[PDB]
Structure formats: C-alpha cells, structure tokens
Write a protein that binds this ligand. Structure first.
Ligand code: HEM
Length: 153
C-alpha cells in the first residue's frame, strides 16, 4: 500500500512524463528491447528492427510507446484502486500476448531508468523508491490475475 506522500511523489514525476508521452515511450521501449532482447521477440510488429537507430526511426514503435504509457498513467492516477483498468490488461498480456511477469519487471526497470534520465530534479531517491513501490503494486496485482488464469508459472 503506498502512502499519500508516496503517491504524490509518483504522480508529480508522472505529470512531467505527460508533457512528452511519445518521447518517453520511445526511450522506454528501446531501453527494454536493448537491455532484454527476448522482449522484442514478443512483438511480431517490431521483431524486424535490428538496430537502435531503426528503433528510433520507427513511427509504429513510438505509437506503441504512447499506448503503453497512456495505459500506465491511467493506472497510476487510480492510486491503487485500479482493478477495472488492470483486468483487461492482464487478460490480454497473459492469454494473447504471452508475456511472462518477469518481463514486467524488465519494463519497470526501463521506466525508472528513463524517468531518472529525463527528470532528475523530480526523481530523487524518495521518488524513485516510491515509483518502485507503485510499479511493484502493478506487478503484484497483474501476477495475481495471471495466477487465476493459470499463467503465473
Ligand atoms: C507497463 C507495462 C505495460 C503496459 C501498461 C502495457 C500496455 C499495453 C496496451 C494498452 C496494449 C494494447 C491493448 C492490449 O492488447 O491489451 C498492449 C499491447 C501489447 N503489449 Fe503491452 N504493456 C505492458 C508491458 C508489455 C511488455 C513488457 C510486453 C512484451 C515484452 C508487452 C507486449 C505487448 C504486445 C505484444 C502487445 C500487442 C502489440 C501489437 O502487436 O499490437 N506489453 N500493451
């Protein structure tokens, strides 16, 4: 359970992300795919991209970063009362996209790296800890729905 103060750290930084959703989404996905190449393989849409420059040139990849970050921002602004928003997400990522929970950990690491790079004066260690808590809470709740569907593994 995050405290009110921890939520405010989270949503303060997040409001900065909302100024440039597509740049951030691009940097996050590129960092995920470079750090953890197995992740790229989950996207038939992007598995043709072999170099970081081709990633950065891809309009389709920047479109998908905005999709991912808009859905994440909608969940964070619920401050933990996010069951309606996580259900469909977990359903599709377990049963259609086949994404292990561990790769949710990976993309959380990429999100924390990118936010430290882009917003260091709003993302000191208090805010980093908080955002880590927030992302852990998303992963706990998606993992519980995986388990329900037979995919926690
Ligand atoms: C912060 C975590 C994530 C969020 C908020 C998120 C959000 C979304 C949304 C909103 C969609 C489209 C709607 C849907 O299919 O449910 C989507 C599609 C998809 N996601 Fe995620 N995602 C996350 C993590 C990932 C990870 C880590 C992977 C792969 C490693 C991934 C793989 C996919 C794939 C394969 C699609 C379908 C894309 C396509 O071919 O159109 N997701 N994601």
């Amino acid at each position: 359970v995050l405290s009110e103060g921890e939520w405010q750290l989270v949503l303060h930084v997040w409001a900065k992300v909302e100024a440039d959703v597509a740049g951030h989404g691009q940097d996050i996905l590129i960092r995920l795919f470079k750090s953890h190449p197995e992740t790229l393989e989950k996207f038939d849409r992007f598995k043709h991209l072999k170099t970081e420059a081709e990633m950065k040139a891809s309009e389709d990849l920047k479109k998908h970063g905005v999709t991912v970050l808009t859905a994440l921002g909608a969940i964070l602004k619920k401050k933990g009362h996010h069951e309606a928003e996580l259900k469909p997400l977990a359903q599709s990522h377990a049963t259609k996209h086949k994404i292990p929970i561990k790769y949710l950990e990976f993309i959380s690491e990429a999100i924390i790296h990118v936010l430290h790079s882009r917003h260091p004066g709003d993302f000191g260690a208090d805010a980093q800890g908080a955002m880590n808590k927030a992302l852990e809470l998303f992963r706990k709740d998606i993992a519980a729905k995986y388990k329900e569907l037979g995919y926690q593994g």
